[PDB]
Symmetry: C2
Subunit: 92 residues, 2 copies
């Protein structure tokens, strides 16, 4: 799981998800069953080449959130922006 | 506060801080007293133009972490990268 904001513009819904350290290509934006918007991203490690960790507090692995819009609300136009670790998806 | 990793390369220390949604220009990287590395960033809101929030779980405001290297360890060469909401500072 990961923090999300959701806004309602006149003709669109906007989902804002935190994803520090997720490379695009590890981001999934997906519609399940035409109603559910599925947002997903995995943070990975930069692989002891004489490099030792002194402190490790950033957990890695997958961030994921599902969002259901009303039934009979068809997703036909989807938008995705990755910027500064925040993913903004705009769905009709 | 915000998650940080710290690695030790042969000739350098590396600090990796999560900062989703912080624009460079709102990032501060600073040496206090030649020994202490001070990393700072503030997340802000994109300002009802017919736009209404339905869900708001991303907290905003300042992220900040201090890191003290040993005394008599002089910071003369500092490095800062912002990428995908992660700030990597490399300090001699």
């Amino acid at each position: 799981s990961t923090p999300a904001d959701v806004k309602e513009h006149p003709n669109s819904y906007v989902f804002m998800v935190d994803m520090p350290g997720v490379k695009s290509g590890d981001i999934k934006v997906q519609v399940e069953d035409e109603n559910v918007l599925l947002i997903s991203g995995e943070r990975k490690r930069e692989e002891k080449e004489g490099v030792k960790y002194l402190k490790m507090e950033r957990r890695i692995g997958k961030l994921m959130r599902k969002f259901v819009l009303p039934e009979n609300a068809n997703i036909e136009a989807i938008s995705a922006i990755s910027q500064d670790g925040v993913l903004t998806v705009t769905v009709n």
